[PDB]
A paper describes a structure:
Extensive structures of the spike trimer reveal the open and closed conformations for the three RBDs within the spike trimer, where the open “up” RBD conformation is prerequisite for ACE2 binding. Upon ACE2 binding, the spike trimer undergoes conformational changes to expose the FP motif of the S2 subunit to initiate membrane fusion that allows the release of the viral genome into host cells.
To our surprise, we found that mouse ACE2 bound to both Omicron BA.1 and BA.2 spike trimer with high affinity, but no binding to WT spike trimer. Two major states were observed for both BA.2-mACE2 and BA.1-mACE2 complexes, in which the spike trimer binds to one or two mACE2. In the first state, one RBD is in the open up position with mACE2 binding, and the other two RBDs are in the close down conformation without mACE2 binding. We observed similar RBD-RBD interactions in all mACE2 complexes with the spike trimer of BA.1 and BA.2, which is consistent with the similar interaction in Omicron spike trimer-hACE2 complexes.
Residue numbers in the entry:
A (entry chain A): 535 to 620, 640 to 676, 690 to 726
B (entry chain B): 727 to 828, 855 to 1064
C (entry chain A): 920 to 1146
Write the structure that this text describes.
């Protein structure tokens, strides 16, 4: 139990872990099926208690690189995988990133990782940071004051 | 108006046969379909995240609200964010977020800009449309009182400014009674936010049809491949596995193609939402029945999980 | 006019300095070419797949297998290639609808920003729009949206109205600003202080209705010349 092993209980061969359950099954049931035709729980044919079958840890591997022209250091991100199970470790909401330091200095988003956290080049090592939305500017509001400009600049903005 | 969707990413090996050793040696002769499908889904994922930044991150500087929240009789406590609750959203957006709510190789990717940062973009735009009027959308923020700001809203729609300065306490009482009845009519209605829900329910209906589609036998003996390899010879059952593999790959690409149309639908709605954020909130629009029914005066945007709500 | 003209030529002269330094500034039209060039090479390299048949080349299976068996693998390769060609145009039809929707956005922009003046705030560039200048492109269009941005701001004491002779006074164009111990009128987007007269103000009712009204004199321009 509690290991990724091949299960075969009167057929139904596959790969998955075995954990103790909590529901009260009916005695005529042999193997339980979850939604959309996936086997959730098969009871032991010998000792007659019930156990859930959870699939193995899987997910996408995202490699965050800054470009070969700058450096060769990378950072691997396992999407939706808690890396308590399989050099700095940072866990985000999308997954836990391996190979990047987390700083408190919030800057502009260069490489979109997810969940409000982006990565960029320090310049030496790959950093991880919360995205800086912008500088705070509390306007001094007053019911007896107005701001009117004295000069002006003409700007020409391009578009593609 | 809907802005973004659920960014989905599909795996190849677990969807077709679900952790089998036969698929890793047999799917490589099919070409590079697994490269092509993930280019389309990640092509959606950077696209839909671009649309929410094109709508909510239109401002560059984060404007903060003054502590003296008196604007000449007007009341904006229901649209400015609450400092007491830790989510920093208003009363309407807490009603907006609680009204609408929401493996086999199918994973869900969360968006980059989280909901508190969309609410912080909503709080910055609400502080800009109150303290400055049109100046924060066209350049630097100029401080202006709200009673004289509404005189700029009134002079643009053709009425001269003496009407507001004689009836300011009636206009301030009429707007506060109207904005108090907005959340009363929004919660009492059952299908007021049905547009954001059908976006969620259609994407929910697409993936559950996709995982039910593997349960079909595809004209073969069974839908599970462990029974096919055990009952027949591997040259005899190779025509049965290729019957299933092209059936499931067509099932996945049909899911990709209709998602590309729906992503092109909502991105076209998000560019429609991007101008309706710009002309109604960041400026004033002289159109007819664009920023609400009637002569446009002002607008107030509110946050949403997968959309945007304008109080025109 | 000497200040506006040199601000305009310095703004249009730094565009070639900005676009040559930022090589990824013109990335948006090149992904249109790069997505089509990657799609045709995907369509070309898909012929190397066997599609579950004996071989990827079709001439040898006509030469090796007998026609009672060879058309079975040919029909596998034909339905694999016809599905490859049908999906390629279908991904092209979604992409052509995106470019056509971008083309009508480009068509309405030159109709509104080049041929005339649009008063929308972030349609023809960021800021107060004055005019624009389109430029040619191999597969798109490049607009040079000339805008108007204010600068060198200054705070002033304001008032909604002015009571004089038992009567209120409301300005026609602009608002009332002040230094302190004086009051003048100016427009909104520029600072131009003028002496308050009856030429730019109008009287409507008494002055004790307006909240926060200040008391000051209004110089009638026909009064000192007649006396
Ligand atoms: C099988 O034998 C074991 C040991 O004698 C016993 O604990 C278990 O209950 C038996 N199971 C059944 C179904 O008889
Ligand atoms: C690396 O950068 C240099 C300097 O910009 C450039 O000349 C060179 O072509 C680049 N190489 C690659 C592979 O991008
Ligand atoms: C992830 O692993 C850590 C370390 O064991 C644990 O504390 C945490 O609760 C785990 N999170 C989830 C969601 O299982
Ligand atoms: C960020 O702040 C926390 C709390 O003070 C501190 O423990 C941590 O070391 C800081 N990290 C960096 C990179 O400064
Ligand atoms: C202006 O605002 C201050 C602070 O909010 C308040 O004390 C004062 O009464 C207001 N004056 C008017 C005329 O509204
Ligand atoms: C705004 O509404 C709240 C809630 O009823 C009330 O407590 C507050 O006094 C109101 N403020 C004004 C200025 O009317
Ligand atoms: C006006 O601006 C000056 C310069 O920034 C500042 O010192 C002063 O406090 C401001 N006055 C008001 C009333 O905002
Ligand atoms: C405002 O400041 C002083 C106040 O005595 C006055 O002399 C000055 O002329 C006024 N400014 C303008 C632009 O008129």
């Amino acid at each position: 139990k509690n290991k990724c092993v091949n299960f075969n209980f009167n057929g139904l061969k596959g790969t998955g872990v075995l954990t103790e359950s909590n529901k009260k099954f009916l005695p005529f049931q042999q193997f339980g099926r979850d939604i959309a035709d996936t086997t959730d729980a098969v009871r032991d044919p010998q000792t007659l208690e019930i156990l859930d079958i959870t699939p193995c840890s899987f997910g996408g591997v995202s490699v965050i690189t800054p470009g070969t022209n700058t450096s060769n250091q990378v950072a691997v991100l396992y999407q939706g995988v808690n890396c308590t199970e399989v050099s700095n470790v940072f866990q985000t909401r999308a997954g836990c990133l391996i190979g990047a330091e987390y700083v408190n200095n919030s800057y502009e988003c260069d490489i979109p990782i997810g969940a409000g956290i982006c990565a960029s080049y320090q310049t030496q090592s790959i950093i991880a940071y919360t995205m800086s939305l912008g500088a705070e500017n509390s306007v001094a509001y007053s019911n007896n004051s107005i701001a009117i400009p004295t000069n002006f600049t003409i700007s020409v903005t391009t578009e593609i | 108006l809907p802005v973004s969707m659920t960014k989905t990413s599909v795996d190849c090996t677990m969807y077709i046969c679900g952790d089998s050793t036969e698929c890793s040696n047999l799917l490589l002769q099919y070409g590079s379909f697994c490269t092509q499908l993930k280019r389309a889904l990640t092509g959606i994922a950077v696209e839909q995240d671009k649309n929410t930044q094109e709508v909510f991150a239109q401002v560059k500087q984060i404007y903060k609200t003054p502590p003296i929240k008196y604007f000449g009789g007007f009341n904006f406590s229901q649209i400015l964010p609450d400092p007491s609750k830790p989510s920093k959203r208003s009363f309407i957006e807490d009603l907006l977020f609680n009204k609408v709510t929401l493996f086999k190789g199918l994973t869900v990717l969360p968006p980059l800009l989280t909901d508190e940062m969309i609410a912080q973009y909503t709080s910055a735009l609400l502080a800009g449309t109150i303290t400055s009027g049109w100046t924060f959308g066209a350049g630097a923020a100029l401080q202006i009182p709200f009673a004289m700001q509404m005189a700029y809203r009134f002079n643009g729609i053709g009425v001269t400014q003496n009407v507001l300065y004689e009836n300011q306490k009636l206009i301030a009482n009429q707007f506060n009674s109207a904005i108090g009845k907005i959340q009363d009519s929004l919660s009492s209605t059952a299908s007021a936010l049905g547009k954001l829900q059908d976006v969620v329910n259609h994407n929910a209906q697409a993936l559950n049809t996709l995982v039910k589609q593997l349960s079909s036998k595809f004209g073969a003996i069974s839908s599970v491949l462990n029974d096919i390899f055990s009952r027949l010879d591997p040259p005899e059952a190779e025509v049965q596995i290729d019957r299933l593999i092209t059936g499931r790959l067509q099932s996945l690409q049909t899911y990709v193609t209709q998602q590309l149309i729906r992503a092109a639908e909502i991105r076209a709605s998000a560019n429609l939402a991007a101008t309706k954020m710009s002309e109604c909130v960041l400026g004033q629009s002289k159109r007819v029945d664009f920023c609400g029914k009637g002569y446009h005066l002002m607008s107030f945007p509110q946050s949403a999980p997968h959309g945007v709500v304008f109080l025109h | 006019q000497k200040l506006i003209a040199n601000q305009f030529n310095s703004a249009i002269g730094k565009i070639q300095d900005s676009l040559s330094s930022t090589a990824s500034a013109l990335g948006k039209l090149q992904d249109v070419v790069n997505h089509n060039a990657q799609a045709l090479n995907t369509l070309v390299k898909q012929l190397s797949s066997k599609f579950g048949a004996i071989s990827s080349v079709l001439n040898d299976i006509f030469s090796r297998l007998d026609p009672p068996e060879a058309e079975v693998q040919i029909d596998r390769l034909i339905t694999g290639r016809l599905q490859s060609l049908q999906t390629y145009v279908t991904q092209q039809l979604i992409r052509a609808a995106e470019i056509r929707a971008s083309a009508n956005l480009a068509a309405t922009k030159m109709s509104e920003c080049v041929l005339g003046q649009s008063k929308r705030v972030d349609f023809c560039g960021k800021g107060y729009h004055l005019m624009s200048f389109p430029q040619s492109a191999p597969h798109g269009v490049v607009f040079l949206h000339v805008t108007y941005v204010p600068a060198q701001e200054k705070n002033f004491t304001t008032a909604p109205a002015i009571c004089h002779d038992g009567k209120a006074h409301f300005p026609r164009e602009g608002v009332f600003v002040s230094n302190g111990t004086h009051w003048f009128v100016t427009q909104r987007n520029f600072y131009e202080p003028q002496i308050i007269t009856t030429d730019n103000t109008f009287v409507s009712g008494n002055c004790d209705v307006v909240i926060g009204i200040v008391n000051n004199t209004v110089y009638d321009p026909l009064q000192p010349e007649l006396d």
